[PDB]
Every structure is written in structure tokens, then in C-alpha cells.
Design a protein around this nucleic acid. Structure first.
Ligand SMILES: [Mg+2]
Ligand SMILES: [Mg+2]
Ligand SMILES: [Mg+2]
Ligand SMILES: [Mg+2]
Ligand SMILES: [Mg+2]
Ligand SMILES: [Mg+2]
Ligand SMILES: [Mg+2]
Ligand SMILES: [Mg+2]
Ligand SMILES: [Mg+2]
Ligand SMILES: [Mg+2]
Ligand SMILES: [Mg+2]
Ligand SMILES: [Mg+2]
Ligand SMILES: [Mg+2]
Ligand SMILES: [Mg+2]
Ligand SMILES: [Mg+2]
Ligand SMILES: [Mg+2]
Ligand SMILES: [Mg+2]
Ligand SMILES: [Mg+2]
Ligand SMILES: [Mg+2]
Ligand SMILES: [Mg+2]
Ligand SMILES: [Mg+2]
Ligand SMILES: [Mg+2]
Ligand SMILES: [Mg+2]
Ligand SMILES: [Mg+2]
Ligand SMILES: [Mg+2]
Ligand SMILES: [Mg+2]
Ligand SMILES: [Mg+2]
Ligand SMILES: [Mg+2]
Ligand SMILES: [Mg+2]
Ligand SMILES: [Mg+2]
Ligand SMILES: [Mg+2]
Ligand SMILES: [Mg+2]
Ligand SMILES: [Mg+2]
Ligand SMILES: [Mg+2]
Ligand SMILES: [Mg+2]
Ligand SMILES: [Mg+2]
Ligand SMILES: [Mg+2]
Ligand SMILES: [Mg+2]
Ligand SMILES: [Mg+2]
Ligand SMILES: [Mg+2]
Ligand SMILES: [Mg+2]
Ligand SMILES: [Mg+2]
Ligand SMILES: [Mg+2]
Ligand SMILES: [Mg+2]
Ligand SMILES: [Mg+2]
Ligand SMILES: [Mg+2]
Ligand SMILES: [Mg+2]
Ligand SMILES: [Mg+2]
Ligand SMILES: [Mg+2]
Ligand SMILES: [Mg+2]
Ligand SMILES: [Mg+2]
Ligand SMILES: [Mg+2]
Ligand SMILES: [Mg+2]
Ligand SMILES: [Mg+2]
Ligand SMILES: [Mg+2]
Ligand SMILES: [Mg+2]
Ligand SMILES: [Mg+2]
Ligand SMILES: [Mg+2]
Ligand SMILES: [Mg+2]
Ligand SMILES: [Mg+2]
Ligand SMILES: [Mg+2]
Ligand SMILES: [Mg+2]
Ligand SMILES: [Mg+2]
Lengths: 112, 116, 54, 213, 122
RNA sequence: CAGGUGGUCAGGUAGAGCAUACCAAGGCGUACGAGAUAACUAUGGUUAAGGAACUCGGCAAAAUGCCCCCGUAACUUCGGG
RNA sequence: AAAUUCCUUGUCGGGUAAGUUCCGACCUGCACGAAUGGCGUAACGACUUCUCAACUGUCUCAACCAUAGACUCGGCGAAA
RNA sequence: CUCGAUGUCGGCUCGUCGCAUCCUGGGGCUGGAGCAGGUCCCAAGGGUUGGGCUGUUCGCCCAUUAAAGCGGCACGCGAGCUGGGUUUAGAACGUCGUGAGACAGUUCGGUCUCUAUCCGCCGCGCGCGUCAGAAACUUGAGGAAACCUGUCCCUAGUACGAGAGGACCGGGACGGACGAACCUCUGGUGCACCAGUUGUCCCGCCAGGGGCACCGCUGGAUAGCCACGUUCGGUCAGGAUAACCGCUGAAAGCAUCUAAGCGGGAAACCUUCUCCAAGAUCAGGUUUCUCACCCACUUGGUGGGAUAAGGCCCCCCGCAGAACACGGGUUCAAUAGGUCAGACCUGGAAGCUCAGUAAUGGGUGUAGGGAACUGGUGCUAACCGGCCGAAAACUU
């Protein structure tokens, strides 16, 4: 419990799945290209959680066209439509920053 | 516990682990220790967290006390005598009483002891 | 830096009078039927025989 | 018509508005208040209204200050401060004993928040005024964080008054201007104020309506 | 964030492989260039037989930054290299196609041609 | 008195070693202390993004570092490099 | 145009986005020159000088942590 | 003036001031169509960038900018730093000298000492005053800080113009730099946190652990402190003027902004906004509390003693802090510790068992361990207490 939990309670979102670092994740982001309101899919390895309730973030990392991209979304953010877990992961760390220096077959997270 | 704000006892940060280990070995052995007052204030949350592992009594608690104390004779008297004596007291196993300061450096002194 | 001129008798006494010991407060203790005086911060150890009254 | 309230800072959190942007708010418990005294111009020389705030035990308040509440018919509070009004039409809407709550502010209004800044101790010149210091190498002997020169030469043979130097810092009355009110929660007595509010988490905070708008 | 002397990677087929920042345009004494900021730069490496040569002073807009950028929704974007696109003086790239992903901060800075030639706009 | 002073003996485990790290035999805690999150100085430690833009000058720091096996240029006094 | 060149940052080429320093040349050598040696030279340098790769709190621009002082209490107690 | 010593260029650091004004603000004239200018007057509030060369000042150059102002202050500033140059001793080249040696000719190397007494300055206290002793809230005499500006769109391709070109005035959006506050986010740090691991010694041994090797190294890391992060600020409206523009109007039957009288007029000045402030000795204002005794003497606006209101000291502490001060607490108590439960960090404990020849892997188990943040709980210490502290009158 915290002092500021009666403020965050109406702003939380139910139905966000359980995912840990190492889990391959699709993220459906609301995108405004002018006045269109489309939906863009971001597929990558979740590498980080930094908790706290309404202030909790997570970081996904993909390899786009020979160039690595990271995105640090907040959980409970209304610009994420829904998260859908693709592949569970079996890692030993909890922050997984060693993936920022490996490319190719050496950056393959296990399948458990 | 709460870390020491400001400079540590005895100079380095590694001497303070050995001082609070030696002062806890001597407190649980005799029952009453005369020392300087800033060391008695620093011993009081450290030594009461070892008595909490005595009240639980399992094997995992004995390995956790042996991470700090190296004297096995005082580990035995902590789990067979000190532990079950505080079996019905919810915390607060120690007491600090202030003594006259000492000649030579005017260091303020206090005694730290178990309750009964 | 050195002192340029020696301080006169009115400036070396106005400073030196401010170097002085502060007195402590004393309270009453009757242990073993003999009344003594200790500071209040040592009032517990007077009632436990930890204070040597010389 | 400058409204005001006394309150306690409760910390910071973030919230999301209708345009799906993130807004850093600072929770301020604009607690229940009471008047206890009205400064009229013909009696006191100016126009203001006292505001009493905070729960306190009735034994912790001494007899000179207890009797100032007995003349107003109010139980003793902890804090006590004045809201400065304009020089005319003093108290047509403030009475002695009136309960002021947090919903005198509307959603989307602006506030000016004044409190006491956190203390930084005896701070040097690179922290207090933002100097540069000499270099970290290339021969610089023992002057890596020192202020340098502080004056001229034989003309003028004095350091000017107002020369920026080292000393204590913090514990200053600091007013932050034009803060947006995101949400007033009348059920909890809480203003969600966008931005930063000066003070430690629990200090006294005067929330007044803005004049610059 | 890019200041002076920062060597960037070049993300089109003009012939330059590596530029070097001179100024950060858009104000006096501006220090940092983010995604979408125009750099006056100099070419320090070129592919042989290219359109541009070594030692040419050209303009370029930054399309990737290793340092994070706070978008107004709470999210961040972070790349593993710094990248620019050499441009004409009417905000159009000198090359004909763009390599690698670019940021969405190019969209509100009226760089409409580099988006439509990019493989993936994030 | 943080300086100087020739020769002899010289253990263990890792190591090429009289280096280095931890230990034996054997010594020693070396003679002002107790406290306390000030600035500043000193000796160390780490650092986002950039990477000599610092500056008289890459000063200082950082970096490279070991064993085995492939590989090695201009020039030359034919050894070298 | 030099460990020698005053005029001088001579002029021309190279390197840098920008080069009074550096390298290659010209010769108008204030005032080079053959054992007070001339012009070269592989190896070598805690030498002087210029460029580059790598790496870096040197810098943009500073932040934080530990320790020895500074600071506080007790003892002793100087100096210009 | 200084030889019984006034340390000299340039740079760094910190400034402060003048206006002979570089930018922004206000105007007259123009060989001023517009856009841009030339020139003169008024104006010092703020701003006036980063690199290449050189010891440089200066200067040329590069890329910008609204602009890259000129000067004083021992050519400001070495008891604040640097030490490349000049200006000791070494050495060399050119030149001069028969020679020792010489050169506003060149080149390489070449110790920068000091514990702040007084004034000045930046902070914080102790004492007394403020005609009784106290406590809370205050007015503001007078001071401080801050003061910068760009691009685009609309007005409008309108006014102007042969065309090319292209507005004044009003309105709106978004930035650069700069300053303050804060720690939600991103990011840095982390010396009593968690985990992996190397050498070695120890805990009798295996298992499990610890001491030491920069915190041994390495991957993380909540709090606190931070900026590279977040939020806000320099606004709007008034008053009195500069240059300049006027109206009414003579001396001077005309005319003239002026001699009587009255207007317009800018980032300057004064209010407005933020902050300090009654040691403002003219020591202020509105309120509330105590509103009371005893003794001696040379009977005094005399000395003491003892108290009320009240505060201080000691005690438990703090995100308050050099000491001191300030803020919270003292059993009618949640103030620090312990303890119990959350949050958060780490990432799957030990023991047992199962699979494998083994290193190791699965299960029991979102495990175990753990600090700062939040709430509960009367367990430990906040004590069985000392020291200060309240009034002559009189005149209208
Ligand atoms: Mg977590
Ligand atoms: Mg700490
Ligand atoms: Mg010490
Ligand atoms: Mg250690
Ligand atoms: Mg502090
Ligand atoms: Mg610096
Ligand atoms: Mg020194
Ligand atoms: Mg130093
Ligand atoms: Mg000796
Ligand atoms: Mg010798
Ligand atoms: Mg050996
Ligand atoms: Mg050795
Ligand atoms: Mg050893
Ligand atoms: Mg000795
Ligand atoms: Mg320190
Ligand atoms: Mg770094
Ligand atoms: Mg890095
Ligand atoms: Mg690099
Ligand atoms: Mg380089
Ligand atoms: Mg500098
Ligand atoms: Mg420079
Ligand atoms: Mg340079
Ligand atoms: Mg070196
Ligand atoms: Mg090194
Ligand atoms: Mg060679
Ligand atoms: Mg030349
Ligand atoms: Mg040459
Ligand atoms: Mg001859
Ligand atoms: Mg000869
Ligand atoms: Mg020779
Ligand atoms: Mg040699
Ligand atoms: Mg002393
Ligand atoms: Mg003299
Ligand atoms: Mg003009
Ligand atoms: Mg003028
Ligand atoms: Mg100026
Ligand atoms: Mg002004
Ligand atoms: Mg260079
Ligand atoms: Mg000046
Ligand atoms: Mg000078
Ligand atoms: Mg000067
Ligand atoms: Mg100097
Ligand atoms: Mg001087
Ligand atoms: Mg001769
Ligand atoms: Mg000479
Ligand atoms: Mg020299
Ligand atoms: Mg030296
Ligand atoms: Mg005033
Ligand atoms: Mg600040
Ligand atoms: Mg936090
Ligand atoms: Mg972070
Ligand atoms: Mg541990
Ligand atoms: Mg073992
Ligand atoms: Mg050992
Ligand atoms: Mg943090
Ligand atoms: Mg005006
Ligand atoms: Mg005030
Ligand atoms: Mg005055
Ligand atoms: Mg008063
Ligand atoms: Mg107190
Ligand atoms: Mg817990
Ligand atoms: Mg397992
Ligand atoms: Mg088996």
C-alpha cells in the first residue's frame, strides 16, 4: 500500500496479461497519422519491468531493418489497445540489458 | 537494517561489520556490555534481528545467523536459551542505559543488555 | 596570512570571555538512603548502581 | 475575489487525460478550513481573512493561543495563516466559523502555490548560484570547485555588497505561478495539481487562485 | 542527443557513409539535436564513385537517436545508432530511398517526403 | 622523524617467478581519542548521450595487456623493422 | 623561407568545413656550405614537432558515494 | 609616490560600471513607391554563440545568429588557479667580436611559498533594547531579484508597383537560450540490498557459508541526492517623462507646440508580479493569556527570595543541520527502534526428493533474502526533574 493509492485506483486498467522479461510480445499501439486513428503492431522481446502501479513501465526490443529499436511503454496506458503474449521466455536476469550488444543467433531467448 | 548515515564506525565500512559481529558475540555471551554510546545505538537494531531468527528456530534461520557470527558456542546459547526466553515478547529484546563518560577522551558511554 | 597588528586589551578580552564551559543541570537521587546529585541523563543508571559516586 | 486554501502536500503521481497524454500531477490535500478572524480595514488597516488548518490535540496548544480560538468558537487547529484580499469589499462572503473546502476551485482553473522549499544545507557556489569552477586537469592546483576572484584591485578596495558566495540554501518561501488544476476530488478533499509543488512531502501549502491567469 | 563533432551514420544512397556535425540549426547557441533536427554537417567518408565527395558541407536531418525521446504520451523510442538523411533546402532528401527505420517525430516537423520513402515509421 | 643502512636464512596453495593474491612458523595492531551525511581540499570509485569539441600541448585519466595457433608491409648496413 | 629568412602568416601545391604550426616545392640565401665538416641514412630515443585509429569526466556540464582532514566535544598545546 | 620588493603579457573563474548603441524598443529627414536601406536624434532593461590557426592581444577564416558593440576598473582579478610568451643559470644555428662574450634575431629545457589579526563580503547564532512577563497572526518605511528574443500561419499575394518583388498595424500557434522549484517519468549515483563468479584461507569434513584481494571483479538496484528529466517564469493593465508629434495662443493686428494653460509619447523611470523586511531606536498594528505573593534595609523607579502565564536545558528523533538555530515527540504517547503486513528491488533459498556415469537440470514454490516508502501493534527507550521567568510615577 502507498499514500497515493486512492488516486491511482480509478486509473488502473483490468485485462492486461501476465508477462515477464524474456517474453515475446505484440503491442497494439494507437497511432494518429493526421486524422486516421490506425493501429500499429510492435513485436519484440520484453526486456524490462520497473514497477509501481500506475507508474509501471515495460520495454520491448525488436530488430527492424538491421537496426535495433527499443520502446518503453507504460502499463495502464490508454494508447495501448491490447497486449497479446506470443512466446514465453526462460531467462535468469530481470533486466536483460545484455541483449543490447548481441545480434543474430546469439540474441535468441529460450523457449520455456 | 537502517544504514549508517554519515561516517561509519572504526573508519571503513568493513570494520563496522566486524565490530557489530564482535559486539553481538559478547552481548549474547555475558548478557551486558559496556561500550561507547554510538556503538550501543548501532547494535540495537542489529542484535535484535538475530534474536528474531532465534525465535523461528528452523535450520534456514541457523544458517542466516552463521553468516554474521563466527563463534558456534554463542550460536548455541542463542537458540537454546535466548530464543525460547523471548518466545512471548513481540520485539524489543534489548535496553540501553547511559553511563558516566570516560576519562581520557570524554567518550559518552552506555550499557546494552537483554531485558530480563 | 599573519596578524598585521596586535590586538588591544579590549579585543582580546571580548573574544576570550566567550571561551567558557557550559554548566550542566543536576537532579536528585536517593539510592541506598544517601541523597546525591547526578545529571538527568544519568538518572536511570543512578537507580541501578551503575554510577560510581566516588 | 482571490480565493485561497491551506493544504498538505502528499506526493506526486501521474494521470492520463482525454487526449491520451500523460500529466504529472502533485497531490495536495486541500483540507477543511475555518476562518477564526476577519481583518477589516477600519479596525486593522487592511483586508484579509485567517485560515486555520490541521488536526491537533487540545493539550498541545498553550493558553495564549487557545483563547484566540475561544473568541471565534472554533476548536484549536495546528496551522494558522492569512489570505490577503484586495483593499475593498472585505468580507461580504467570509464569516467567522465558515467551513471552506477544496471544491472552491474548478477543473481547469489556475492556481498559485506557495510553500517552503526543501533545505540543501550550507551549499557551495557551484550548487547555490551555478558557477563553473576551474578545470579538472591542466595544472589546476586545488581550485576545482572554488569561486575564483571576488573583486577588482586597489580600486575599489572592497568586495561589493551582494557578491554571490557560499552559504545556506533552501527553507525559502517559494511561490510557483500558474499551475493547472487537473481534478478536484470533493469526496477525498484532494486537488490534483499539474506540475511541481515546493516542499517536503507533508509540508504546509497555500493554494491561491492565479492573478496572471 | 547530437552536439558539435558528433559523427553520424548516413541513411540514404547519396554516397556518404559518415557525416560530422558542425551546427545545430534553429537558434543561437543551441546544444542538442533530437529526432527531426537539421544539422549542418561535413562528409568524412564516402563510397567511391558517389554523388557526394569527402569534405562537402551539406545539411541533414536527424532520423535516429540513441538517446531516448519522451513522446507526449509517456512512451519512449531508442535506437542503437545515430542516423541522418542529407537533404535539399526544401526538406526533401537528395537520395532516392532511405535505409532503416525513422522516428515519428519527423511527421510534425514537416518532413513528409522522408516518411513516404522510409521502410518503417515508428 | 613517512628518508638512508652491507651480508646470511627464506615455508604452503595458485603462478614462468625472490612478481602478485591469500596463508604457515613467528611477529604485530606503532603511543592522542570520541563523534558527526556542511562548504572546500585531498586519495580513490562509477557515469546517460557525444568522443579532444578541452588545452600552449591528449597534461591527467581511459585504453591495450596473458598462453597457444594462423598471419605480417614500406624500407635495409640483410642482423633487423 | 631551414634548430639558420628581418620584411613574413613570402608565393604555389597537399592535408582540415576552417591550418601563422606540419609535409612537398620554388629561390628574391637581411645573415647556408664542406672534419667549428656538407648532403643522405636502416636501427635506436622518459628528446622536439604534426596527422590518424582506438579509448576516455580533458570538455559540452556537471551529479553521486566512501575515506583522510576541515567541523563538534575532552587532553596537550606552538608559529611567522 | 614606491629600490630595508607596488610580482609583469595572454587564458580560466567571478564580476561591476560608463554610453561614444551591435541586437531588440521610440522617432525626424531622405536622391523614403514597396521590401530593404543611408543618416541623425532619444534610449543602458536584458541579450551579445561554438570551432580552425597562433603563447598570443589583435587579426584572417568556418558554420551560424535577432546581434556576434566599444571601453574603464594596478592595459580589473597570480595571500583565486594556470605558466605557453617576455625576463636567470644548460645547449645550438645565423650574425658581430682576435678573445672572454653579445643580439626587441631564432630554437629546445627550465621550483609559482603562506594556518586570515583588522576592514569588506556571504551565512548562522548569543546578549540587551523595543517602559510589566509572555504567545500567535501581521501592515511595509525601505531594499533585493527578475527584465532577452526568434520562425511559421492568418490578415493578404491585399495596400505599393511597368514587372520582378512584396508590407505597416492587429490576431494566433510552436521554439532557442536563461532562471527557479520538484523527483511522477527517462537517466546518473548506490561501501549494513539481491544474485552470478575467480584465487586463497577458515568454519573438523561433505553440503552450506564467511574473512581478504579497489565495494576483488561482474549483472542489477528501492530511498536520498541529482539533470540529460519533469513543471512553471519573465505577462497584462496603469502613472510620470525622453526624442518627436501636437491643440489653444500672445508679446509681434500676421505667424509661432509656449511665455499663462492642456494633450499624445518607449524594453529607460515609478507602480503592478516574486522575495527579504519594525535593530524602521518614529523600534509599529489588531488580539489572547497570567493579571500574583513574601523578606530585609540606609524606606529607595532599593535589594533579595519564591511563583503564574510561558519558554529553555536534559530525553526520543527528523528529508532541519558545521556548532548553534529551526520542526516534530515525551505514556492522555505511534517519535525513533523492534515486530507484523503490504509496496518496491533481486530472480527461483536451504533441507528433502526425482532424473543423469557426471558437471548440472525438474518438482515442493511468483520461492528465499532485503534498507530508507505506507499502515497496524504499547514490546524497548522518551525517566520518579532541574534552571529561568510578571509593573514607581507624574502633567494636560
Ligand atoms: Mg517489479
Ligand atoms: Mg547513504
Ligand atoms: Mg577520525
Ligand atoms: Mg572488502
Ligand atoms: Mg541535507
Ligand atoms: Mg567543470
Ligand atoms: Mg598545494
Ligand atoms: Mg587536484
Ligand atoms: Mg624511522
Ligand atoms: Mg642500498
Ligand atoms: Mg613463495
Ligand atoms: Mg610480495
Ligand atoms: Mg594478509
Ligand atoms: Mg612512530
Ligand atoms: Mg565528507
Ligand atoms: Mg560518459
Ligand atoms: Mg556510453
Ligand atoms: Mg569513437
Ligand atoms: Mg583525434
Ligand atoms: Mg572551458
Ligand atoms: Mg579553445
Ligand atoms: Mg582544439
Ligand atoms: Mg600520459
Ligand atoms: Mg590506468
Ligand atoms: Mg618505422
Ligand atoms: Mg610560411
Ligand atoms: Mg618545408
Ligand atoms: Mg676546407
Ligand atoms: Mg672548417
Ligand atoms: Mg655533425
Ligand atoms: Mg638513452
Ligand atoms: Mg579542542
Ligand atoms: Mg616594508
Ligand atoms: Mg530611420
Ligand atoms: Mg545617446
Ligand atoms: Mg550591457
Ligand atoms: Mg523597469
Ligand atoms: Mg586538429
Ligand atoms: Mg568589461
Ligand atoms: Mg592586469
Ligand atoms: Mg581587460
Ligand atoms: Mg594573470
Ligand atoms: Mg593579488
Ligand atoms: Mg669570428
Ligand atoms: Mg635581451
Ligand atoms: Mg622557452
Ligand atoms: Mg612538483
Ligand atoms: Mg516598498
Ligand atoms: Mg536549482
Ligand atoms: Mg520514487
Ligand atoms: Mg531511472
Ligand atoms: Mg548481505
Ligand atoms: Mg565445499
Ligand atoms: Mg584472514
Ligand atoms: Mg531513484
Ligand atoms: Mg507604457
Ligand atoms: Mg512577510
Ligand atoms: Mg536602514
Ligand atoms: Mg513589536
Ligand atoms: Mg523542541
Ligand atoms: Mg518487510
Ligand atoms: Mg530449482
Ligand atoms: Mg542418480
Amino acid at each position: 500500500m502507498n499514500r497515493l493509492d486512492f488516486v491511482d485506483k480509478p486509473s488502473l486498467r483490468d485485462d492486461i496479461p501476465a508477462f515477464n522479461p524474456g517474453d515475446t510480445i505484440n503491442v497494439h499501439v494507437k497511432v494518429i497519422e493526421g486524422a486516421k486513428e490506425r493501429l500499429q503492431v510492435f513485436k519484440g522481446v520484453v526486456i524490462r519491468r520497473q514497477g509501481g502501479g500506475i507508474r509501471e513501465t515495460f520495454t520491448v526490443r525488436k530488430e527492424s531493418y538491421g537496426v535495433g529499436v527499443e520502446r518503453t511503454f507504460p502499463v495502464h496506458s490508454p494508447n495501448i489497445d491490447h497486449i497479446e503474449v506470443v512466446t514465453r521466455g526462460d531467462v535468469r536476469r530481470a533486466k536483460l540489458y545484455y541483449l543490447r550488444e548481441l545480434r543474430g543467433k546469439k540474441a535468441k531467448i529460450k523457449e520455456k | 537494517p537502517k544504514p549508517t548515515k554519515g561516517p561509519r564506525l572504526g573508519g571503513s565500512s568493513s570494520h563496522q561489520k566486524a565490530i557489530l559481529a564482535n559486539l553481538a558475540t559478547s552481548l549474547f555471551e555475558h548478557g551486558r556490555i559496556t561500550t561507547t554510546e554510538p556503538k550501543a545505538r548501532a547494535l540495537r537494531p542489529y542484535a535484535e534481528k538475530l534474536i528474531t531468527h532465534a525465535k523461528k528456530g528452523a535450520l534456514h534461520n541457523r544458517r542466516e545467523v552463521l553468516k554474521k557470527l563466527r563463534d558456534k558456542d554463542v550460536v548455541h546459547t542463542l537458540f537454546a536459551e535466548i530464543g525460547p526466553f523471548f518466545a512471548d515478547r513481540d520485539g524489543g529484546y534489548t535496553r540501553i542505559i547511559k553511563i558516566e563518560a570516560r576519562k581520557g577522551d570524554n567518550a559518552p558511554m552506555a550499557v546494552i543488555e537483554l531485558v530480563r | 596570512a599573519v596578524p598585521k597588528r596586535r590586538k588591544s586589551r579590549s579585543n582580546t578580552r571580548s573574544r576570550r570571555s566567550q571561551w567558557k564551559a557550559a554548566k550542566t543541570e543536576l537532579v536528585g537521587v536517593t539510592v541506598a538512603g544517601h541523597a546525591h546529585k547526578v545529571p538527568r541523563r544519568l538518572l536511570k543508571a543512578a537507580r541501578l548502581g551503575l554510577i560510581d559516586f566516588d | 475575489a482571490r480565493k485561497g486554501i491551506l493544504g498538505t502536500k502528499l506526493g506526486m503521481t501521474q494521470v492520463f487525460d482525454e487526449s491520451n497524454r500523460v500529466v504529472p500531477v502533485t497531490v495536495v490535500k486541500a483540507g477543511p478550513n475555518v476562518v477564526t478572524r476577519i481583518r477589516t480595514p477600519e479596525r486593522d488597516g487592511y483586508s484579509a481573512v485567517q485560515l486555520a488548518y490541521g488536526e491537533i490535540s487540545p493539550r498541545k496548544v498553550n493558553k495564549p493561543l487557545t483563547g484566540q480560538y475561544t473568541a471565534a468558537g472554533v476548536n484549536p487547529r495546528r496551522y494558522l495563516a492569512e489570505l490577503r484580499l484586495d483593499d475593498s469589499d472585505a468580507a461580504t462572503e467570509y464569516q467567522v466559523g465558515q467551513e471552506l473546502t477544496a471544491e472552491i476551485f474548478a477543473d481547469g482553473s489556475y492556481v498559485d502555490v506557495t510553500g517552503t522549499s526543501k533545505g540543501k544545507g550550507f551549499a557551495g557556489t557551484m550548487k547555490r548560484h551555478g558557477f563553473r569552477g576551474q578545470g579538472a586537469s591542466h595544472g589546476a592546483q586545488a581550485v576545482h570547485r572554488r569561486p575564483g576572484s571576488i573583486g577588482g584591485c586597489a580600486t575599489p578596495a572592497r568586495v561589493f555588497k551582494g557578491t554571490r558566495m557560499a552559504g545556506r540554501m533552501g527553507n525559502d518561501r517559494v511561490t510557483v505561478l500558474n499551475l493547472l488544476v487537473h481534478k478536484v476530488d470533493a469526496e477525498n478533499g484532494v486537488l490534483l495539481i499539474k506540475g511541481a509543488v515546493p516542499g517536503r512531502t507533508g509540508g504546509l501549502v497555500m493554494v491561491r487562485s492565479a492573478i496572471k491567469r | 542527443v547530437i552536439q558539435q563533432e558528433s559523427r553520424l551514420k548516413v541513411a540514404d544512397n547519396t554516397g556518404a557513409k559518415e557525416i560530422l556535425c558542425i551546427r545545430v540549426l534553429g537558434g543561437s547557441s543551441r546544444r542538442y539535436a533530437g529526432i527531426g533536427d537539421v544539422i549542418v554537417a561535413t562528409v568524412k567518408d564516402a563510397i567511391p564513385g558517389g554523388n557526394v565527395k569527402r569534405g562537402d558541407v551539406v545539411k541533414a536531418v536527424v532520423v535516429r537517436t540513441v538517446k531516448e525521446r519522451r513522446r507526449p504520451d509517456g512512451s519512449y523510442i531508442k535506437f542503437d545508432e545515430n542516423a541522418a538523411v542529407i537533404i535539399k533546402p526544401d526538406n526533401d532528401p537528395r537520395g532516392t530511398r532511405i535505409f532503416g527505420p525513422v522516428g515519428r517525430e519527423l511527421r510534425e516537423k514537416r518532413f513528409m517526403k522522408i516518411i513516404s520513402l522510409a521502410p518503417e515509421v515508428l
